[PDB]
């Protein structure tokens, strides 16, 4: 009888949202529906384009029910407030969405409450102004959750999906596979933070005040994460956006999506995570996440930059190109904070910078660099959390070792209470793989210096891709 | 240094309405004056304009209904960071 989606997000051990308020920007809603009556406040804010009744409020009503519905909702408690930015045809404007976001911020300033979650179950093409407004609202301390988009395309080409600091959610089905429907389906790629149930999702139907209907979409998926976030923020109201994102990743089901569904180049970029509620088991723990940059593009001196949130530390930095035409990567300071920078090679199509960003308070971290030797070595003379290497040439023990013609960089942290170890694995090979042990957190992933495309952490597994390769994982714990 | 942007997905563009985004610390009083200035400069050129909304609190700026003919003029206004043509969003 439990809807498949609500079971799916239930953790393997278990035992809401009322201190939190969830704003919904959507079609009009049937607020007297019994799933949500008394739980959704209609603001009567409205900014919608002209057209060009049951149908008018179907989308919004269903999603209010996914978030907060008394029988089929994720956060059955939660208070919601709704703004109307989509017309009867499900169409809105960028300007209308901006005015809506601005209305939420003004409301907050006039009558402050607790943590706010804003669900944006909508998408248009990439928009500079919409992304900037989202970013600004996130920096003001509001959590934003948005749909990845339903076009079976790269979510970075859409807004607010592509918007920095917003939690972007793709849709998976009952078999934990990405939703597809011909040329249509869940978006994917590096702007998606995680997936959540978004096919065959039962919820309030505006056909009648007690009716239910199954609907599909990345908005339904996003509504699950909005619900989960509201619950997480009720339990731990002081969470920063970066702490909340790290928990959502950490409590997700991992490696359950078959990545064959995605286009080949998007597989490495797309997180293999399906959202879940935190377990009754939660005592400090080391949380890390992998942050892929935008592709640098093909310019000879091109660089890609991957950054961490202000309250995170960059513990390592890697890079990847599909061709292998690569000059590696280095950690460089920038506004007094370390970023991961990767360098394209001459004639390369471009590269990605790949940061490992971790929540490590009281850490004092530095970088130790050695320029090319005649091989090259550097050590934390402190625990080593990461090795990087870059070169300027066209071709060839708390210690990092690089090529004799390359610079080598060690990330060294003073982190009392932190234990780290290094695990190596090598074989004759398109891909070699080495995983940290359960309860340990991968902080760094690199290849021992036959032609490597790059290296990247996937959860707590270090992956090395080549065209006698040895993967090296640095693993730490409290 | 002010730049123009519109939706790459051509069917989703909504020409004739523009979001004028001003530089980060621009004050509401300045946004309002910049809007009136655009309308005055436009009217002298024979163009009707309508200021639909003045933004403050997240981004400073304003929403204006006008011919795209005026974009070169608008990009030269004081405080302008960039201008974006309005476009469609859709239930997902």
């Amino acid at each position: 009888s439990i809807p498949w989606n609500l079971e799916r997000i239930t953790p393997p051990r278990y035992r809401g949202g009322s201190l939190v308020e969830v704003y919904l920007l959507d079609t009009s809603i049937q607020s007297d529906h019994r799933e949500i009556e008394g739980r959704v406040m209609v603001t009567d804010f409205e900014n919608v384009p002209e057209e060009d009744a049951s149908k008018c409020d179907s989308h919004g009503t269903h999603l209010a029910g996914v978030v907060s519905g008394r029988d089929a909702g994720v956060a059955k408690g939660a208070s919601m407030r709704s703004l109307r930015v989509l017309n009867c045809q499900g169409k809105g404007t960028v300007s209308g969405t901006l005015i809506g976001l601005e209305f939420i911020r003004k409301s907050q300033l006039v009558q402050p409450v607790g943590p706010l979650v804003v669900l944006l179950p909508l998408a248009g093409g990439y928009s500079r102004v919409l992304n900037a407004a989202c970013q600004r609202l996130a920096r003001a301390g509001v959590v934003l959750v948005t749909a990845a988009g339903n076009f079976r395309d790269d979510a970075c080409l859409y807004s607010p999906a592509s918007a920095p600091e917003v939690i972007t959610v793709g849709a998976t089905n009952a078999q934990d596979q990405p939703v597809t429907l011909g040329t249509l389906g869940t978006n994917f790629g590096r702007c998606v933070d995680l997936f959540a149930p978004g096919e065959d999702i039962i919820g309030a139907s505006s056909d009648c005040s007690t009716c239910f209907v199954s609907q599909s979409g990345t908005s339904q998926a996003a509504a699950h994460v909005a619900g989960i976030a509201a619950m997480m923020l009720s339990a731990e109201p002081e969470l920063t956006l970066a702490e909340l994102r790290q928990r959502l990743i950490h409590f997700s089901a991992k490696d359950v999506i078959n990545e064959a569904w995605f286009p080949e180049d998007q597989r490495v970029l797309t997180p293999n995570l399906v959202a879940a509620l935190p377990p009754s088991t939660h005592g400090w723990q080391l949380f890390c996440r992998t942050v892929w940059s935008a592709h640098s593009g093909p310019t000879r001196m091109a660089t890609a930059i991957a950054r961490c949130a202000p309250d995170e530390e960059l513990l390592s930095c890697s890079s990847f190109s599909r061709s292998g035409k690569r000059r590696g990567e280095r950690m460089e300071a920038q506004g007094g904070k370390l970023v991961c920078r990767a360098h394209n090679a001459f004639g390369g199509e471009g590269v990605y910078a790949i940061a490992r960003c971790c929540l490590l308070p009281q850490a004092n971290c530095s970088v130790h660099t050695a320029p090319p030797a005649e091989g090259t070595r550097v050590h934390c003379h402190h625990v080593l959390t990461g090795c990087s290497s870059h070169w300027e040439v066209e071709d060839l023990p708390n210690q990092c070792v690089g090529h004799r013609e390359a610079s080598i960089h060690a990330s060294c942290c003073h982190a009392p209470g932190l234990e780290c170890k290094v695990k190596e694995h090598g074989i004759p090979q398109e891909q070699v793989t080495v995983a940290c042990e359960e309860g340990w957190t991968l902080t760094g992933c690199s290849a021992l210096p036959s032609h490597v495309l790059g290296a990247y952490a996937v959860d707590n597994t270090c992956v090395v891709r080549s065209r006698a390769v040895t993967a090296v994982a640095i693993c730490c714990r409290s | 240094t002010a730049t123009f942007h519109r939706c790459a997905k051509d069917p989703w563009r909504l020409p004739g309405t523009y979001v004028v985004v001003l530089k980060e610390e621009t004050h509401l009083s300045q946004s309002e004056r910049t809007a009136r200035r655009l309308q005055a400069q436009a009217a002298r050129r024979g163009y009707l304009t309508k200021i639909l909304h003045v933004f403050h609190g997240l981004l400073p700026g304003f929403l204006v209904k006008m011919s795209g003919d005026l974009l070169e003029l608008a990009l030269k206004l004081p405080h302008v960071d960039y201008i974006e043509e309005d476009s469609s969003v859709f239930a997902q």
């Binding site: 079609t27 499900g90 339903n150 429907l181 609907q215 908005s219 | -």
Partner: peptide, 10 residues
């Protein structure tokens, strides 16, 4: 897959 969800037919 309902028509109220862009871009499904509905």
């Amino acid at each position: 897959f309902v028509g109220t969800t862009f871009a499904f037919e509905x």
